[PDB]
Every structure is written in C-alpha cells, then in structure tokens.
C-alpha cells in the first residue's frame, strides 16, 4: 500500500530561492541548503559577474560579489555546491541524500516565497527511470521555468534523490540531475571538496548525461533546456 503521511517541512524549510544578476541579464532558481552550503544547479552561473540574492526562511541575504563564492563543481552533472560567505547563517544538517533506485516513487517539494507566509508544497507522486549513464532521470511532475534546483524526494524513505534540472522543448518530459554516489560523504569530509571560485559556464549550451542542454528554450536522446 502507498506510504502514509510523510512530513516534508524539514526538507522544504531548507529550500532557498537564488537570483544571480550579472552583466545585465539574470538567472534565478532554487537550491537546497545544507550546513554552510547551498546545493543548486550548475547552470545558475551562466554568467558570474554580479550579485547573488539568496532567500531562505531566515530572510533575504545578498552576495555583493559572486566571483568570491567558493564553488565546487560536480563532474558530468548540472549540479554544483556553493560555500556561502562566513557571515551567513548556516542551515541544519539532517537532510539525507542518496542515489535514486530504479522505478521508485518521487515527489517534487518546494516552498512558498511570495510571503504572506512560508510553506511546504508537495507535488503529486511519479515513477522515475534513468536516461543514459544515470545523470538525468525522467519524471512527469509538472515543473515550470525557474523551478530547477527543487528537490525530488523518495516517497519510500524520504531522501532527496536529485534536483529538478531540465525539460524537453514541448515541456512534456522532465529531467532531474541525480544525486551522485557518495554525495553525503562529500558534504561532511572537507577533503573530497575541490573548491574554485569565479567559475561560470560561458557557452549557451552543454552536453550532460547524454543530452544537449540549452540555457533556455530556443525561438541519442532528446534535446532539453534548463529550467
């Protein structure tokens, strides 16, 4: 029988809304906060020469200079880790991550940020299967642009198994970057962490887990764009 009531507030309370404003244009999406880090979408840095507007339940912090942000890239994935400034209020460290086991049930979890209140928001349940190496994974939970970086949570155990990343062009197939192996290890042992700063993607497309990814919808597997 489908699993009973599950509490997702612990997971959503850690969700942040990010907005990068460099050289004119701006990219904004979500990220999962963990300890001194925010886990988000490597494609947040389509440009990296401005300000980062973080928006947690603690309020709104702003990073005056993106280029100073210590960042650790996840190879072959549209994922990345950000070490927030030293004068930044940490996030707890209870979230549990793990790789997505074939055919399991997952739900997209968010938070309401238009204020008037703060709030969990859980989507409908959906099956999920890989796509090539296991980089991106397929799910059919409606997702809208700007919603990348949102956690996909295992209805089974409650772990986060990946962050929503891209969508095909008609918007009828959705893909999320999976958690990588030994990811948890990577979050506590400040050794496997390979920091750099000022990194950016300075291409308007890139190849990941088998598909071509455009930082935006235009005018092997199917094309996709990052949401």
Domain that holds residue 88: 15-95+179-203
The bridge status of strand 50-56 relative to strand 37-41 is unpaired
Same domain, 116 and 104: yes
E strand or H helix at 183: helix 183-188
- Distance from chain centroid for Cα 109: 11
Residue 48 belongs to a domain with what CATH number? Answer: 2.40.10.10
Same domain, 137 and 162: yes
In a domain, 226, yes or no: no
Sorted by sequence, the CB contacts under 8 Å of residue 226 that are 6+ apart come out as 41, 43, 78, 148, 165, 166, 213, 214, 215, 216
For the chain, what is the largest distance between any 2 Cα atoms, rounded to a whole number of angstroms? 52
Can you give the resolution of this entry in Å? 2.7
Nearest to 121 by CA among 99, 98, 147: 147
What does the alpha-carbon distance between residue 73 and residue 71 come to, in Å, rounded to a whole number? Answer: 7
In a domain, 109, yes or no: yes
What does the alpha-carbon distance between residue 21 and residue 11 come to, in Å, rounded to a whole number? Answer: 27
What does the alpha-carbon distance between residue 153 and residue 168 come to, in Å, rounded to a whole number? Answer: 21
Same domain, 104 and 173: yes
What does the alpha-carbon distance between residue 177 and residue 80 come to, in Å, rounded to a whole number? Answer: 11
The bridge status of strand 211-214 relative to strand 224-226 is parallel
In a domain, 212, yes or no: yes
E strand or H helix at 10: helix 9-12
User: Where do the DSSP E strands lie in the chain?
Assistant: 15-22, 26-34, 37-41, 50-56, 59-63, 70-73, 79-83, 105-112, 119-122, 126-127, 136-139, 151-154, 160-167, 174-178, 196-197, 205-208, 211-214, 224-226
Q: How many domains does the chain have?
A: 2
Same domain, 192 and 81: yes
């Amino acid at each position: 029988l489908f699993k009973g009531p599950r509490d997702y507030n612990p997971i959503s309370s850690t969700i942040c809304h990010l907005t990068n404003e460099s050289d004119g244009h701006t990219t904004s999406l979500y990220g999962i906060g963990f300890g001194p880090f925010i886990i988000t979408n490597k494609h947040l840095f389509r440009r990296n020469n401005g300000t980062l507007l973080v928006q947690s339940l603690h309020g709104v912090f702003k990073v005056k200079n993106t280029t100073t942000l210590q960042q650790h890239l996840i190879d072959g994935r549209d994922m990345i880790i950000i070490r927030m400034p030293k004068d930044f209020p940490p996030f707890p460290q209870k979230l549990k991550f793990r790789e997505p086991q074939r055919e399991e049930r997952i739900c997209l979890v968010t938070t309401n940020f238009q204020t008037k209140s703060m709030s969990s928001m859980v989507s409908d349940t959906s099956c999920t299967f890989p796509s090539s190496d296991g980089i991106f994974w397929k799910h059919w939970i409606q997702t809208k642009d700007g919603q990348a970086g949102s956690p996909l949570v295992s209805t089974r155990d409650g772990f986060i198994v990946g962050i929503h990343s891209a969508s095909n062009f008609t918007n009828t197939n959705n893909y999320f970057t999976s958690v990588p192996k030994n990811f948890m290890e990577l979050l506590t042992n400040q050794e496997a962490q390979q920091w750099v700063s000022g990194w950016r993607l300075n291409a308007d497309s890139v190849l990941w887990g088998g598909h071509k990814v455009f930082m935006s919808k235009p005018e092997m597997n199917e094309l996709v764009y990052s949401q």
